Design a protein around this ligand. Structure first.
Ligand SMILES: Nc1ncnc2c1ncn2[C@@H]1O[C@H](CSCC[C@H](N)C(=O)O)[C@@H](O)[C@H]1O
Ligand SMILES: [Cl-]
Ligand SMILES: [Cl-]
Lengths: 139, 156
């Protein structure tokens, strides 16, 4: 339905939450090693992820608080790739650089230095994408 | 503007996450006792939550005191349950609405669910036969969907 990609996740409970979200929504989960702890696929690194999956870059979105891409605008489609960063530092700047600026997407928040919980961010993005697809598969 | 109501929450990290989600979204948080855990300013600070992030949170002795104290519009209060509900996303939400969630393990007590008209009963869509979502994630999805319908007013 959709692809969730967690880059170097750190905190076990967030990934547990996301596995549960994927199961409920039909999203496929991709974890990019190294992880902070010991359908789902685990990839040695980012480069291996791209070689294995060959994502269409036009349909790849990097969620980051530093993004200028607006969440509210965005049309998501089945098969898109929703990429999320680790809890402490977020996505590495050099990885965010590979996404075109409009593909770097920020979820709105009240003013100030803030970020959403990782698993919350993933659930909002997936449910909004799922809404746009009419919740196909859902009861 | 939006209100989140946790009825008898059990798992402490869920409530901690919901406090932060409310600060990030500008939602008001209400808890209804009995809680599954103590609330102490030292425990909060230890969790990494700053005083002003949770100072406006309201704790209610029980449901009837909550209603008495807040006087929520029944037509604008939504209960999260499976019994007789419709899909959450079907409903049009307004600033100031109330979203009522039960314990992640228990769900809302039938006693309470029976007080809500079917129209006000809502659930998130799920693929059949799966465990429910983490409560924190459910609240996030709820608040961000209601906020989307208001055009993310006051957010950027
Ligand atoms: N408002 C928001 N918009 C888009 N993505 C967000 C978000 N809040 C959190 N995230 C996602 O959640 C991940 C972990 S939160 C990252 C926190 C980091 N210290 C920072 O200041 O950004 C991020 O890498 C990002 O994918
Ligand atoms: Cl959050
Ligand atoms: Cl709970």
């Amino acid at each position: 339905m959709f692809n969730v990609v967690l880059v170097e996740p750190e905190i076990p409970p967030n990934t547990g939450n996301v596995i549960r979200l994927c199961a409920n929504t039909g999203a496929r989960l991709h974890l990019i090693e190294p992880l902070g702890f010991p359908q789902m696929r685990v990839h040695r690194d980012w480069d291996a992820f791209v070689a294995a999956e060959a994502p269409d870059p036009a349909r790849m979105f990097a969620f980051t608080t530093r993004g200028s891409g607006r969440f509210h605008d965005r049309a998501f489609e089945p098969g898109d790739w929703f990429v999320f960063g680790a809890e402490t530092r977020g996505l590495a700047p050099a990885l965010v650089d590979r996404f075109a600026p409009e593909q770097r997407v920020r979820l709105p928040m009240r003013p100030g230095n803030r970020s959403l919980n990782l698993s919350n961010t993933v659930a909002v993005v997936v449910f909004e994408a799922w809404r746009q697809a009419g919740f196909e598969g859902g009861a």
